[PDB]
């Protein structure tokens, strides 16, 4: 049983490898060879939000495409007004090392987590007129890498202890535990219908989870190093991942395999952020060489560059109406492009 | 109102920006340290009215390649050493040669003839300064271990970060962080 199961485990690895190749009748780069490419996309910095003292690890857009939360490692959680560049809130965090932040789709709460292994939920709309921490989702055994609201009372978090968790905010206990990853779960992405979510870990693997049942549906290999970023296609039938191998890859949930690879010879730095446009035709990816590279998600052609940051680009997010792209970086600046 | 909803928004912004200015004074007055070797423990000690903040990582997994690039802007990484000696020589090798910790200095606190065969043909340098009482067996071992970490430091130093090996104090960390800041200032002026 100690090794007769390792022999049986690869009997299914080669069976899944053959079911994925039998359906690989074509290539995304073969059937999109006749579509017209996108023009050279030259987006310029519209706003530059200053006010963070240290590195910025995460930002998240609001659903109204106007407010955005930002998380810096100096111990602040600043809520901005992207149109006016006015700071709306500034929440002093108890732990200084926060690696993620989320914005509730209602706009009432913001999440935050980091090396304290705790997800803090901050109530923005309080009657007494202040931002107070409402809940502290403790019990996750490893640093929080990502967190995403499902409702005002439900949130999925990934942690560095190889485990994702689904929390009921009012009671404060995990309703589901998503185990199966081998390394630190570094990011997660919710589906547009919030029925599934995908997560990438440090084992060069990405898993598709079912929020309601709690099982792992599909596992997507193909990357060579830790997956640092992940994002669904706008229609929720595909997702893109970013890895330390310096490539991005597009996986299809139904074909159950990798469709396209976004790599370049002059690129030898890891991808820290991955986001899609509103249409899904573009693929904006933040890198370690301090600039972002807009890709043509249908032809794998480098379409543009967002080069305005002085340090490593950490976070990157597109508005819900596709109007602007906000990127944070270790130089403590948030630049909004268009 | 288009005009009164923006003045009340600039009235709140100026109150946010005047508080971030006070927080910037405390953030720059404090020196952040990472003790290496809840989810993170904070130790706020003070030496001669200088605020320090040591952060023991606490309850994290044995895989550090992801949460250790958080501590790339700390003043110094305090590396405590206690085979367990070669494992600390490889952990120092990765911290020293990491692309994000290449500007962070390391303060080394050092709390065997079979694990290291080059220890037999090793003579204590005449530059050694021991206090009387230590037999030549422990003094030759204290300086051989120190010469193993300085071999990693002098191979890839380049002038961005420095190693401060010691033997076993917070006064040494106080005196070593001042040397780190002074060299950081001399490097900005290109005097070094």
């Amino acid at each position, epitope marked *: 049983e100690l090794d007769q199961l*390792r022999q049986e485990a690869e009997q299914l*690895k080669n069976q899944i490898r053959d079911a994925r190749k039998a359906c690989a009748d074509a290539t995304l780069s073969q059937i999109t060879n006749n579509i017209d490419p996108v023009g050279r996309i030259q987006m310029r910095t519209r706003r530059t939000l200053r006010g963070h003292l240290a590195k910025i690890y995460a930002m998240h857009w609001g659903t109204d495409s106007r407010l955005l939360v930002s998380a810096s490692q100096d111990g602040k959680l600043i809520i901005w007004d992207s149109y006016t560049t006015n700071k709306v809130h500034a929440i002093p965090l108890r732990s200084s090392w926060v690696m993620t932040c989320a914005y509730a789709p209602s706009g009432n709460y913001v999440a935050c987590g980091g090396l304290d292994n705790i997800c803090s939920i901050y109530n923005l709309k309080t009657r007494e007129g202040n931002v107070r921490v409402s809940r502290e989702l403790a019990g996750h055994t490893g640093y929080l890498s990502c967190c995403r609201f499902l409702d005002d009372n439900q949130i999925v978090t990934s942690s560095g202890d*190889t485990t994702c968790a689904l929390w009921d905010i009012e009671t404060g206990q995990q309703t589901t535990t998503f185990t199966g990853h*081998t*390394g630190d779960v570094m990011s997660l992405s919710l589906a547009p219908d919030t029925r599934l979510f995908v997560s990438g870990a*440090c*084992d*060069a693997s990405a898993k598709l989870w079912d929020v309601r049942e709690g099982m792992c549906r599909q596992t997507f*290999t*193909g990357h*060579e*190093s*830790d997956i640092n970023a992940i994002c669904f296609f706008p229609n929720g039938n595909a997702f893109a991942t970013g890895s*330390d*191998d*310096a490539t991005c890859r597009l996986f299809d949930l139904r074909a159950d395999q990798e469709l396209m690879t976004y790599s370049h010879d002059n690129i*030898i730095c*890891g991808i820290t952020s991955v986001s899609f446009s509103k249409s899904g035709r573009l693929l904006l990816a933040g890198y370690d060489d301090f600039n972002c590279n807009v890709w043509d998600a249908l032809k794998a052609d480098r379409a543009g560059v967002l080069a305005g940051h002085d340090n490593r680009v950490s976070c990157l997010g597109v508005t819900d109406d596709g109007m602007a792209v906000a990127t944070g970086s270790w130089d403590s600046f948030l630049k909004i492009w268009n | 109102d288009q005009r009164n909803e923006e003045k009340a928004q600039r009235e709140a912004n100026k109150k946010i920006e005047k508080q971030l200015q006070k927080d910037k004074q405390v953030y720059r007055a404090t020196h952040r340290l990472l003790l290496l070797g809840s989810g993170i423990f904070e130790t706020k000690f003070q030496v001669d009215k200088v605020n320090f903040h040591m952060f023991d990582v606490g309850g994290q*997994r*044995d*895989e*550090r*390649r992801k949460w250790i690039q958080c501590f790339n802007d700390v003043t110094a990484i305090i590396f405590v050493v206690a*085979n367990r000696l*070669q*494992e600390a020589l*490889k952990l120092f*090798d*990765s*911290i020293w*040669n*990491n*692309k994000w910790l290449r500007d962070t200095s390391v303060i080394l606190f050092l709390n065997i003839e*079979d*694990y*290291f*065969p*080059e220890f037999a043909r090793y003579t204590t340098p005449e530059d050694a300064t021991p206090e009387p009482g230590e037999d030549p067996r422990v003094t030759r071992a204290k300086y051989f271990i120190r010469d193993e970490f300085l071999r990693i430091s002098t191979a*890839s130093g380049d002038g961005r970060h420095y190693c401060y090996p010691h033997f076993t104090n917070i006064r040494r960390v106080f005196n070593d962080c001042r040397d780190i800041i002074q060299r950081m200032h001399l490097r900005q002026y290109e005097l070094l």
Partner: nanobody, 126 residues
Framework: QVQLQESGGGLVQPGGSLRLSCAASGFTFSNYKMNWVRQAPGKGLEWVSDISQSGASISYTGSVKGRFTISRDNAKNTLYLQMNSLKPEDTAVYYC?????????????????????RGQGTQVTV
């Protein structure tokens, strides 16, 4: 998929030689620094030897210098470990560890926690 399969191994008399192999798959072998990591029965994982992306900056642990020699073949994606004059304290499960990022000089690949980029090990008994 990153796959590292170790071969060689086997029981050998004290003083005999042994050659370990490592067939790598699912990644560009030339971009990574490869390691060798063992686990003695009763102890934890300890690092044995590493080799650079090309094969220039070779390193060993003190207990194996002069006996072991690590070598790689980037043309066929194979990592080697020629173990000469073995002694009974070299009995362990030898893993072919790869450190996670390419084009780097730092590796964190001896973790007692489940580490992803290393093989299943080959048993060496002396």
């Amino acid at each position: 998929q990153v796959q590292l399969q170790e071969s060689g191994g086997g029981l050998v008399q004290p003083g005999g030689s042994l050659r370990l192999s490592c067939a790598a798959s699912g990644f560009t072998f030339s971009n990574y620094k490869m390691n060798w990591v063992r686990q003695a029965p009763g102890k934890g994982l300890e690092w044995v030897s590493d080799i650079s992306q090309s094969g220039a900056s070779i390193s060993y642990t003190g207990s194996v210098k002069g006996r072991f020699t690590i070598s790689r073949d980037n043309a066929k994606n194979t990592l080697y470990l020629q173990m000469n004059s073995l002694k009974p304290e070299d009995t362990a499960v030898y893993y072919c560890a790869r450190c996670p990022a390419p084009f780097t000089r730092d590796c964190f690949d001896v973790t007692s926690t489940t580490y992803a980029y290393r093989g299943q090990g080959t048993q060496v008994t002396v």
